[PDB]
């Protein structure tokens, strides 16, 4: 239905990385030769890399993501090489909140810190955000598009989760709300839910066993449900996130019941088939009336009600199966195909540290 959540990238002001870095290189290496000149060169290339990674808000393709990924790898590889733990290298990174646009009475919501850990955290945020945007753009009617989305949602999930676990010790002060552990923990779960949904779409497209499709859908329902519960009392994410999560929780439960009902029919459990279709119809009716402007469930609704009408007609006239109450049905199982991908530098392809000989 192409109703996937993605995250906007954080904006940052342009910073001259070169000057504060080579000024230390000229200090520690009084050699007026080529080692000082090659570091100074690599420092010039690092400042250029920052401008390419976070200065141009463009290009939802892998080249832009790999540039972001490469710049994250480079910064992580530099914290030990340069005395950044002490504030003798003056470098201030200013980043704006990804979500809080700010009232027109106090400007935008910005934070400036002289911290590499702050820069790492915001850069990793944009890696995850851009990955979520690339995943959300994939054609899910194509197997390669599905695989790209599955990989990128799991990456985004693991990167938001890495920020959750490290942002506090990395920052001296308290972060903006967008990178705060509560926000990125919820984003991590949203991306994990969407990765699981992609596996459900993959299973449906490949015509897998309905028993398996039901367990994949049921697990996606659990992830969407957990995510929307973390948004229930928070207004930090954009307005459309909460209704979309609530809708997807119910759509996934309905998909689980629908595919479980097909299994029931195949087993000649006609009463159970009707009970599960009635539950799917109820869930889809609730989504159609509450979240109408966020999802389109008309085709699914017609499929359910065509199946439920035929089931009831034949059961009343032929089989006379008792239709069980929902609470007397056995629970649908759960199958999780997704994991939050850990961030292990290097996360970029063919990475080469610019300060490796140091």
């Amino acid at each position: 239905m192409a109703t996937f959540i993605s995250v906007q990238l954080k904006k940052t002001s342009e910073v001259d990385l070169a000057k504060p870095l080579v000024k230390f290189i000229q200090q520690t290496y009084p050699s007026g030769g080529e080692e000082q000149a090659q570091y100074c060169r690599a420092a010039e290339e690092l400042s250029k890399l920052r401008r390419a990674a976070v200065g141009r808000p463009l290009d939802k393709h892998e080249g832009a993501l790999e540039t972001l990924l490469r710049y994250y790898d480079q910064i992580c590889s530099i914290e030990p090489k340069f005395p950044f733990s002490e504030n003798q290298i003056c470098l201030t990174f200013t980043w704006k909140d990804a979500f809080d646009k700010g009232s027109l009475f106090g400007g935008s919501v910005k934070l400036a810190l002289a911290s590499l850990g702050y820069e790492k955290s915001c850069v990793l945020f944009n890696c995850a955000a851009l990955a979520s945007q690339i995943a959300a753009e994939q054609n899910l009617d194509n197997d390669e598009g599905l695989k790209i989305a599955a990989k990128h949602y799991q990456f985004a999930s693991g990167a938001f989760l890495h920020i959750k676990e490290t942002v506090l010790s990395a920052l001296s002060r308290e972060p903006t709300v967008d990178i705060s552990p509560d926000t990125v923990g919820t984003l991590s779960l949203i991306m994990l839910a969407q990765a699981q949904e992609v596996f459900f779409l993959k299973a449906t497209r490949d015509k897998m066993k309905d028993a398996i499709i039901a367990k994949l859908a049921n697990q996606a329902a659990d992830y969407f449900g957990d995510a929307f519960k973390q948004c229930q009392y928070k207004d930090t994410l954009p307005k459309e996130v909460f209704p979309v999560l609530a809708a997807k929780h119910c759509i996934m439960q309905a998909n689980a019941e629908y595919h479980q009902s097909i299994l029931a029919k195949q087993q000649k459990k006609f009463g159970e088939e009707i009970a599960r279709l009635q539950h799917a119809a109820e869930l889809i009716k609730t989504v159609a009336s509450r979240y109408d402007e966020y999802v389109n469930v008309k085709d699914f609704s017609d499929k359910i009600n065509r199946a439920l009408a035929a089931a009831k007609k034949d059961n009343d006239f032929i089989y006379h199966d008792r239709v069980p109450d929902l609470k007397d049905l056995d629970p649908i199982g759960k199958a999780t195909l997704v994991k939050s991908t850990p961030v292990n530098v290097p996360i970029s392809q063919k990475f080469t540290d610019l300060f490796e000989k140091m």
């Binding site: 599955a150 897998m208 066993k209 028993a211 199958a335």
Partner: peptide, 13 residues
Amino acid sequence: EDDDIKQLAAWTT
């Protein structure tokens, strides 16, 4: 079933 899940798991390659 169980092997159907295993083949789906080995997909992201």
